[PDB]
Structure 1
Amino acid sequence: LAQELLRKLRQKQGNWVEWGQAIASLQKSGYNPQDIFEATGFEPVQQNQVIVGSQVYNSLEKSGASAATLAHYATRGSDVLYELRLLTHEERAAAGDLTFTHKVDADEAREIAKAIKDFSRFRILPEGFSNHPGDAVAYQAWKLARQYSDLQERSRLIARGLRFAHSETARKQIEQLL
């Protein structure tokens, strides 16, 4: 009797991971996605963001995140957690905490998930940085700020460089720019 997962959607019953998981039930019982929108108000383009989000949020509380991150990402903050899809199971919950505090938008957490991707693509840690994503986006913001030889152009990358840098050794590398 899978029709009671048809009912909990046009009544607005639950929160967004509760719909993010009830879709993948119905996507394992022979459903064409095209006809899912006929009885429930979500086209599978819009369902696509909460499939992958609940495929992240089951990994967010798994990998040891804090309480307030697991409180607000139960209710709001949807498409940011769609953008952490290109990571692994081990570093998403480290970034779910970090992209909550700064209240970043869709496109900014797009590139933070890109910056932690290349910082973890490396076989080697670069100088003065650790495993935290606050060091990841402050490594790129310093690696791409060495190339300016001008003072009043690099502080666009130093204010953001002093916005994320997590350990104190990663704070000194930003301080050499000044």
Structure 2
Amino acid sequence: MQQLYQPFRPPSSPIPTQFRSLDSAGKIEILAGRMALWFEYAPLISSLYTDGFTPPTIEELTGISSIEQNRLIVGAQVRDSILQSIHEPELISAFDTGGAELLYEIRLLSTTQRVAAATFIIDRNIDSKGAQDLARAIKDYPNRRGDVGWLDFDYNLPGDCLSFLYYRQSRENKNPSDQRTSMLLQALGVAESEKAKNRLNTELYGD
């Protein structure tokens, strides 16, 4: 049953090699039975969208709500953007079971700055809140073109971006006050460049 006047639909969508010769009912019965992992059957729903299957209809048939559908599609797209570039397989073999809710937050970063973000977020076991704040801190870096000690934090790696965020947030105060100490100590606990570190020690201690 076609629903009238959806002229904004794309032409079609690509399907993996293993499913290039299936019908709609095949996609339905492979989605309903979970007979694959998420990054295998995310393109299947992404393709079913372009045949007049609204997210409510797929939720009625298969049994996954629209929020989960969108999360899975975006996560699979982010993963496919990660794997096709400079990387290392420590993470692709770790994003096999349950990595979509974390891949949904680095979607704001361009493909150049996604492998470093993935390394930083999986090396320390960070959840969605920390990932969101990390991506926002990374995206806020080029705006502060000039500030107190901006060029001492490199931006080709997430630790220094988040450390610069903490460091500039700590400067909105005065003599230690027992609140700046917490923010500076939390800043030195995430930085990973020796220049940022020696600047943070130069300002927090001794001088």
Q: TM-score, normalised by structure 2?
A: 0.77
Larger Rg belongs to: 2
CA spacing shift, 1:120–1:28, aligned 2, 3 Å: farther
Q: How does 1:153-168 map to 2 (within 5 A)?
A: 153-168=179-194
Contact 1:138-1:164 within 8 A present in 2 as well: yes
Query: Match for 1:60 among 50, 62, 82?
Result: 82
CA RMSD in angstroms, aligned pairs only = 2.0
**Paired residue for 2:162?**
137
- Tell me the amino acid that sits aligned with residue 127 of structure 1: L
Q: How does 1:27-106 map to 2 (within 5 A)?
A: 27-106=49-128
**Paired residue for 2:172?**
147
CA spacing shift, 1:165–1:22, aligned 2, 3 Å: same
Is 1:112 matched up with 2:129?
Answer: no
SS of structure 1 residue aligned to 2:133: helix
**Paired residue for 2:13?**
none
CA spacing shift, 1:122–1:158, aligned 2, 3 Å: closer
- In terms of mean alpha carbon deviation, does 135-144 or 55-64 score higher? 55-64
Query: How far apart in 1 are the matches of 2:185 and 2:43?
Result: 39
CA spacing shift, 1:48–1:147, aligned 2, 3 Å: same
CA spacing shift, 1:7–1:156, aligned 2, 3 Å: farther
Describe the superposition over 1:77-117 as per-residue Cα deviations: whole angstroms up to 9, x where unpaired. 32121112222222122201111111111111111010011
Query: How far apart in 1 are the matches of 2:144 and 2:96?
Result: 32
Query: How far apart in 1 are the matches of 2:58 and 2:170?
Result: 48
- Percentage of matched positions with identical amino acids: 30
- Tell me the amino acid that sits aligned with residue 141 of structure 1: Y
| Structure 2 residues not aligned, in runs of 5+ | 1-22
- Runs of at least 4 residues off by over 6 Å: none
Contact 2:76-2:100 within 8 A present in 1 as well: no
Contact 2:28-2:62 within 8 A present in 1 as well: yes
SS of structure 1 residue aligned to 2:119: helix
Q: TM-score, normalised by structure 1?
A: 0.89
Aligned length: 178
SS of structure 1 residue aligned to 2:188: helix
- Deviation of 1:9 after TM superposition, in Å, equals 2.4
Query: How far apart in 1 are the matches of 2:114 and 2:173?
Result: 32
- Tell me the amino acid that sits aligned with residue 37 of structure 1: E
Higher relative contact order (CA 8 A, sep 6+): 1
| Structure 1 residues not aligned, in runs of 5+ | none
